[PDB]
Structures are given as structure tokens and as C-alpha cells.
Amino acid sequence: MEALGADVTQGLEKGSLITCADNTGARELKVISVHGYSGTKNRLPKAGLGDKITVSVTKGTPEMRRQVLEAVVVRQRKPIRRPDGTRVKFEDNAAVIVDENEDPRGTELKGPIAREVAQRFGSVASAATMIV
Amino acid sequence: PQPSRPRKGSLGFGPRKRSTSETPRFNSWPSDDGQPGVQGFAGYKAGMTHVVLVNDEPNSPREGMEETVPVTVIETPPMRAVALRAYEDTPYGQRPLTEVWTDEFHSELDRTLDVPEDHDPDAAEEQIRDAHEAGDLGDLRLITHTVPDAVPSVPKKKPDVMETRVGGGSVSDRLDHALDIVEDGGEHAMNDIFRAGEYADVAGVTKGKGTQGPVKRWGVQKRKGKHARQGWRRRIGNLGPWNPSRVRSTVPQQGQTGYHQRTELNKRLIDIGEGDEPTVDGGFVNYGEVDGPYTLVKGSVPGPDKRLVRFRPAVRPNDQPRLDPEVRYVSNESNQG
Amino acid sequence: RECDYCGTDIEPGTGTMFVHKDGATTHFCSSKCENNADLGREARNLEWTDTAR
RNA sequence: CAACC
RNA sequence: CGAGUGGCUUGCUACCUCGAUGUCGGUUCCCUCCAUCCUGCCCGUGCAGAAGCGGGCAAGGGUGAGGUUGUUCGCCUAUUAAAGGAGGUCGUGAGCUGGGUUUAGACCGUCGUGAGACAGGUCGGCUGCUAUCUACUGGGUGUGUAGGUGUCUGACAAGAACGACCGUAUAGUACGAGAGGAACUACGGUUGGUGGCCACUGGUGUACCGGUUGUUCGAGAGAGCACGUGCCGGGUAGCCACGCCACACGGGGUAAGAGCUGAACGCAUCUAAGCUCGAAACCCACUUGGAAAAGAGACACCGCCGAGGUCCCGCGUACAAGACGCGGUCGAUAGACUCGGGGUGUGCGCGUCGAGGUAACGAGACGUUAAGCCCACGAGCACUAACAGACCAA
RNA sequence: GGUCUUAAGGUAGCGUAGUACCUUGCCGCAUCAGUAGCGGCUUGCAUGAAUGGAUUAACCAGAGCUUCACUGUCCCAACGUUGGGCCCGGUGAACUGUACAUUCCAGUGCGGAGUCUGGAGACACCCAGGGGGAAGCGAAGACCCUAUGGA
RNA sequence: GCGAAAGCCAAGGCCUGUCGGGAGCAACCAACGUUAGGGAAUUCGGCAAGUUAGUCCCGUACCUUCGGAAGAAGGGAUGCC
RNA sequence: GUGGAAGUCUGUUAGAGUUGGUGUCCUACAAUACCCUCUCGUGAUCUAUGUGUAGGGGUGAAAGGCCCAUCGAGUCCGGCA
């Protein structure tokens, strides 16, 4: 993928439960897999800010519940490092549901997003209210 | 089904024993290209700090922007090429033929060797030039040594001696180039060889850790879950199969870890100066203060503070040189805190 | 930059920026300040702080 | 599959 | 239908072991095989492209995470370049596990008149040992080569030290009616592996500073105990990874394959002689070890009445003993002291305030006070201690 | 089959069961995915009434399953604490020992060799280590069979 | 303090749960403390560890042999002067 | 409201016991030990001393358990070489 523009310490693994920062009707997402990732023996697959992941809906509306969808990680509690040396961290871990074309399934994003996630997913960004 | 997995640790840096010479010894040298010139230099590690640099990379989306970069401060005072050794090619490889020494010696070079009192530089030179006429001359190298005394933070006064190859134009020309340096007094500096922005390979003897177990030394797993409470926590599963009925040298075991020579490739020289611009408030921890000739190396360098590190023009650079990077800031914030 | 907590200048190439839930941003110069903030202490009530001084 | 069936 | 190869399954035999070679599965750690799943290079196609399908060379590297089940296998899920198979006493219990299997207790079904039986099911159910030799990982002392210091050589030896992927430009281009949709090359990044390092972030930090509960020292001050910190908050050095840095290109020879010249065979023919090319594979490049390489090495200087070395002393860039390294007055090597740089968070005492209370008394607040206390770091400084002195040596 | 053996021929209930071989039975629930678990169905290899059937509040260091919470069980390991370990004084055993023994790769051999054969490697001694091998030590195999053995 | 509970302290007893000396004291082992983010992914199985916790107030389901279930659950309070 | 029942609850009160760690130990401190966790603790309770039951016999809320480290028939000596 296109360089992210910052170094990331993945703060999530397969199985982690995160916030769905949108209005798709999904409230909580479970990480199932990480796009393009391949680990090593015994290593739990990890995902962090900027990765595209496959998720299952754990909490939300009946129609959304249990659906296996694609998403993009927009916030994480574990710090990331920007070119100027500063570390950046969020209040929670969150992702936004996305389609085949990486366009947000929802109409609105909830909460801030990392600028780096913009470079990658512009259409996701063109839905963000706050970009930090 | 027993999943695959690469083995633990590299088999390419063995045996993992205590280094024989604390002074690093390059086992390779740059190729002959430019004008004749000494292919290396040395200094003493002081510590680290960081600097803000203007992205120099012409292919980076950030070209021309502020960028914080880690730097290891190495004190690199002038050294003294004290002699010119000549190697001759033989059926059994390269062998020392003779050496051409000088008269002017640093006041304390006698703390390491028996300094010459009676030597014939012309007889030696004569034998060398005849070797060249015959076409039996191998490469040409300079016996070099440091001046620890010039570095206050380093307690040693005894000079560290190393042989550094001289490459360059034609042999005849670099032979003459070698002799010129030596004759003077051999005194040369970091500037004379490197330029800020070029890539250097740094060699040094890593920090010693004495005896350590397989987990730390080779990176094998610790025993997991229930297997961690029965009496075995940091011991590998087994030393090998029933057959072969012997333990292979490839199974990870305890032993000396650290204090090994390492040659780290493509280290970018961020800046070569002199003074106290890089020094840190309160002084570098366990080292002291810097106020003299110094070199800022991008990233990390093997070895503890005070150890002798060696520089050599990168023999396998991946990127082209982007000379004299613009340094907008050099942290002097205390390293204690 | 200045530390949004204690008031001292943040040494460049240092510190962490915490992004609040509502999108706000707090630039901390160190863990000490972050940790006091997590305890719910307000910088003005801590004598050692520039904000206080 | 680790004896008996 | 016919001919074989393997020794992964099963069967057969009863050769070895019953004065015992511990029994499935898993796990951990190491080496290997190729009948190749991916990656490299090719050939064919019912090959436009993209993509399939089949075949060849090839074992360098990779081949992962999860749900049921003790399971092997298998079924299933999301990822992936791919998530290949097999050997090593079905590698691996003087390594682990003990779910299964495999005693003694008990139940069910079936069988048995009964005692009792069942690779049928089910609940419970014990795992000893201070390593002699050998093997290897690291560390020393000697001898040999035959006075000392310093610097090297390189026979050999090890490496995967690098493997793979995504994205952008190429290009909505070549190709194709359209749909769809490449490549050479140049770039940015990710991942797995590898070595190292601590400026940054993060952990630790029973150094240290503070808060505070119970109790004891009459109160105060200052302390002990509450497990090797009572508990809680912060955290220096150091050590660390979750942090940071670095880890090619290019040559040479080939395989499959593409060809050239070319005859046997006037022609033809990539082959018989000769030659041009051509794989992640082989060799070199690069890193690491390496004078005990018995052809036991090379060079320079010093010394043979003295070069150098040992003991001794102060110490760590070193360290389980040993080893290693630095300094020893021609000195800043360690400590003290003073600064600097750091940690904590505002000391004791006193003064004002303080809900009240006749008063006594009074939790606590402000000031004095960026205070007090403390520091495994740095500088300065010969104040103390590196003194005195003994010995070997061609 | 629409009686026959041998008296009767399974009623109420329960049912893929701690009983179902087939079997991961079929449907549903739950999970991204559930040979598990629960509900239903059920022709029950081979359930069933004091050989007690069914059912059941309370109880339980009894067996199985799910959820919330939490966490170094795990990703993936780090630093620290105390006692050992290491060095020194003193004290001072045992196990085990046919012999020889510096081994490695192959082969051979009663087919599972440090000792045979061919090669390779190998200067002696010592310290620490984790245990690959000595089909390691410990116990005349408890399994299996055999004995005109025992209980 | 509810307490013959814990913890601390008297009276009384002891330094004999009887080998010491030394190395910032390495690997490794026994006990144990602290671990960012994720939170059972580990495993036959949450085994081990942890979480909760005392007292008062509010409030408390299915089911039930009407006893119980029940401290269900869930919520709030807690010092000193 | 009183009352204070219960093979009733909590409880390392004393005392009794022992689910798990398959922890420590396994030439042991110990021929059955140590630590944490755990169960019972007004009763078919626990416990001291005395006393009775004897080997094809006892005793057994039944495990072939126990009858002096010995039990699907104790120990000793004899039969017996």
C-alpha cells in the first residue's frame, strides 16, 4: 500500500473488539483478519492504524449483527510515530466499515480520524468531521 | 501438523565467542575508483542525541520537510598514519613485504609498541618500487593509530593501532600518495576521507553481556502456559533427535553473548564538525563532555560508550550520496531524565 | 511548542499528543505530566508546574 | 492410535 | 492390459530385545528428502488480453492464525504469494504435557446361572535419578611450532543474511467490438527473518522522593514492623521492545529452455567437436571465526643485561573461576567536596487564617519555600587512596 | 404374518441418553467458523417402570456448555526481589564401575556398533552448562504366552 | 475489630526451625513483585494467576416442596475535624 | 414485636479433614513431608484414657478397607534342607 506517512505499533489483534465509528448501524466490531498480512508461527495476527481489516459485527442493529464486512482502522490507543518524532495516540480503538472500493458504507463518521488514514482512504476522509 | 518456522538466530555470526581484538578489523575494503586515498578512519563512541533534518531524499513525498533523526555522537580526532606497509602477491595469497616508517611519533605511541630508533625508509621504499616493477605488488596499506589523549572522556592514553588500506588511482600514484602522508607525520582527519552525507560502514565490538541463556542469546521461546511451571522456564525442548546420536552445533545453547565484532553497513554520516554543538546537558551519561572533532552517525553504532569504532567508505551502498544534509536542530537536552 | 499541561517548552522531536474523544488535542511533554493528568490533577494546583508558577 | 477379545 | 520405483499406510514373518529400548496426540528444538504448494526461469494451449489449464528446470527461502474434536486425519472460517507432502526409534517423556490410552474405585448398555467380560461408552485416578564417559555450546591452563612488542596473512569453517508482498508512475496504455486489461523499467512502503542500539516512545527500576492505613517508641519531630516495598503515586541510571538503526547492485559458470556455426548424411539438423545466451538455484561479491594450516605462516621494530613481563596498587568499555581492558604522580584511576545535570513535589520550625468552641482545643489552608530530601551521571579539584616495594627475563 | 420359540411380547413415561454401533444422525440455537453444549425430531445396533420409571425446589472441593467482569494463559517477552547457583574456609556422603575408551560418517554384524571394516576427524588437561547418545541408572516385564505352578 | 480473626505491642522466652566468608552477585532453578497495547487468541479444560471483597442504605428475577432461591442481580455510601 | 429452632449458613476460634496446583520434595526434613488454595466445624461431631472383639477369625455407612511401614486371609517360630 501507499506509504502511511508514520510508523505504527499495531495495537490490535485478531479477535479484538473495537468501536465502529460510523452510522452504519454497527456499534462494536470484532477483528477477524488483516488485509495483506502474513505472520509467523504462534503469532496472533496484528492490525493497527491505517490497515484494512475484515470484521464481524458483534453489537449493533439486527440486520448488521453477525455480518462479515471490511473496515479501516481509524483510531487506536497504542501510540504511532510521526516524521517529526512526536507520538500520537487516541482515546479508543475504532474502525469504519468500507466496501469493495474502500468507500465508507455509512453516511457519517463519528469522532476524530488520523490524518495518515486520509492519504490512504480519501473517500473515507471526505466523510470525516475531525482529522488530527 | 507442526507448522514451519525459521530457526532461532543466525548461523552467520559464529562461533558466538569473545572477540580477540577489541579494536575492530575490517575484512574487506572499498573498490579502487576515485583519486588515491586512505579508505578508513576511527573514533570513540560518546553517546546519542537527535537532530532535526530537512528531508534530502529526492524521491520522498516529504522532500524538503522537517524530520527528526536519531544520531550517535562519535569523537573523531586526528589520527596518524605512521607507516606504509606493502603486500606482495604470492602463490599462497598476500603477504607483508616491507614497511616504510617515519621519525615523528606521538609522545605516547610507546605505550603500545617499541618505536623504531633505527630505520631505512629509502631501502624499504626501494624494495617496494622494485616489487612494483616486477608486478608482484599487492594492495598498499597504512599502519594507523589513534590519539586517545585528545579525547578527555576516554581514560586510555595507550593508542589503538590498525592497518587501513589505501585505494585510488593507479598503484604508482597511490603508492606516492601513501608515502607523502606517512612522511609528514601521518596526521590526517575525518574530513580528509569522508564528507557529510556519504555512507560509511561502521565496525565495532558489541557491548558485552557475559553468559546468557538461549532465550536472550538466540531468541528461542520461553516455555509456555503449563510448560512454564513444572521446573523448566527458559530451557529449550530438546538438544536434538535420537539420531544423529550427538548434539549439533546448530542447536541454540547458552554461552558468551556480546563483545563480538560487528560491521554495520550503510550508516549515513549526518555531519562532521568540531566543538561542542552535539554535547548534551549534564554530559553524556557514563562518558563525559564533547568539545573537539566529532562525527554524527545516523542511528546506532555497535559498542558501549568509549569503545573504538572504525569507519570505512560503504562497500555496498544502496543509495546515492546526498551531500551535506541541512541540520536545523541538534538536541542538547540532558540525557538524564 | 508548549506542554498543554505544565507549560514548559516541549523539546522538539519529543513528547506525545493525546487525541481526546471529542476530537480535542493535548500535547504532553512527558509521562510525568500525562500521569498527573490521568490522576485528575490540574496543573495549576501543582507547584512545580510553570502553569502554577 | 496408544495388547489381550 | 503390461513394466517398475518407494518404504509414508496396511498385511505377513517371528530375525533382535521380556534380569523392561516407556506406548497416542500435542508441544519445544535441530538436521534432512523431493514425488514442488508459493517464490525464480522456461515449454505448450481448445495461448488476443487478463486469467486459467497442462508440462519442464529448480529444495535458496517461505508455507502462517483460528472454531468442534484427546484426536492423527478431517470438516469449517477469515486472511495469504502459498498457507505442499515426507524421513530423522511413526526424531524429540535421564525435555515438557497427561486430554486419550493403560491397573486398583464406580456407573450404563450388551453378554454371562454366577464370579465376571467388552481397542463399547462414562466420572476419578502416581511421571523416580546429585551426568562417569561421549556429544555439543561457551570459558580457561599447558605443551608444540622456538627473547619481546605491534600489525597482518588465509588454508579451512559458518550464513538465508536476506526471503516475500502491497502500492505509484508505466497506463485506463499494449491487447480486445466490448467487457475486461497487462509488461520492461524507475520509485515509495509492508511483512517474515537477521545483527545491533537506547537520542525518541514504552516497560521495569524492593536507588530515590512523596501520600497514607494499623500498631509501637508518651505527643511533636523522627522512626521500626505489616515478607522480604504495608499499601498507593511519580520515577534517575542501567537493562529492555512494544521503541530506533542497518541488512545490494554487479560479476562468473550452468539447468530447463531460446539460438548460432556445423558435420556424420553434398541437403537438413541448437550437438556429435565449437559457440552466444539463460533460474530465487551453483561460484564470487558481503558478514563472522580462523597460526595447532605439523609446509605449525608473513612484516616492522625493540631487546639479549636487559626489551618485555609478573607480583603489587586504583579501577571497569570486561567478567560465574580463569580470561579481558584501562590507569598508577611523566597521573584525574576510584572516593570526598563543590558546581553542573537529574528524581520527587514544597521540609522542620515559626506567623496569619481556620468550621466551631467560655476556654482548652482544633482537621486543614496560605507564607516563609522552584522548598526540603535524594542520585549507580558529568565537570572541576591531587584533599584521601593509586604508596612502598618485590621478582622473572634470551 | 393380517401365530412361532419359550410364559408374556414393552403399557405410563423417557429417548442419538454417563445406554445409539451406524454418528460429526436431521432441524434449530450460538460462533467469522462449534465432532462440543442446549432445544426439537427419534425406526431405541442394544430405553422403560422399587434390575424402579418420570420428574424435581434445595444442597455439592461431583461431570459438561455459555455469558458478563478480569487478567502476562497467550501475542512476546522485559525489568526487578529473596533463597540457591559461581568463587573461598571447614565438614563431607551416595548412586554407579567386565575391560578398553578423543570421536564422526557410512557399511557390516543375532537385522538398533565409541570398540568389527573403510574413510574422515583428532595436541593434553581443566571450568561452567543444557541433557543428543551410552538401545544411560534404578526394579530377574506388572502386559503376552509357557508350567500336568500358587492363591 | 464482630471476634479466641489479621496486623502491631507487653509479661515471659529466644537469636539453636545452629556452618560461615565473597562476587551489583552471570546462565539456570525455587518462591515472588511490576509489566504498554490487545484480552482466553493460550489449553483437553481459564490449569495457574487474577477479578470481587468488610459494613450501611436502596433494590432484587426464573423457579419453589412456600422453607427457600437471596449476599440473586444491579445501584449508592464509607476518612478526618 | 417477642422467642431462639436447625444432622441451618459464614468462619485457618479450638478442632477435624484434604478439591486443585498434577506446585516443592522425590539418595527427602519425612519409607507418605512442605506451601498456597480448598471442605467440615451443635453434631450420624471431634477428641483423651480405660476396656472389649483375633486370623478362614475380627472389624468394616462396603474401598477387599482395616486388624502395629505387613492383608483377595496378620505376625513369629516350627513342619522345612
Ligand SMILES: [Cl-]
Ligand atoms: Cl487471520
Ligand SMILES: [Cl-]
Ligand atoms: Cl513450551
Ligand SMILES: [K+]
Ligand atoms: K492386558
Ligand SMILES: [K+]
Ligand atoms: K520385551
Ligand SMILES: [Mg+2]
Ligand atoms: Mg501453535
Ligand SMILES: [Mg+2]
Ligand atoms: Mg535517559
Ligand SMILES: [Mg+2]
Ligand atoms: Mg525526555
Ligand SMILES: [Mg+2]
Ligand atoms: Mg524370535
Ligand SMILES: [Mg+2]
Ligand atoms: Mg532406558
Ligand SMILES: [Mg+2]
Ligand atoms: Mg524434480
Ligand SMILES: [Mg+2]
Ligand atoms: Mg534447505
Ligand SMILES: [Mg+2]
Ligand atoms: Mg516417535
Ligand SMILES: [Mg+2]
Ligand atoms: Mg529422550
Ligand SMILES: [Mg+2]
Ligand atoms: Mg518420564
Ligand SMILES: [Mg+2]
Ligand atoms: Mg531427571
Ligand SMILES: [Mg+2]
Ligand atoms: Mg476426560
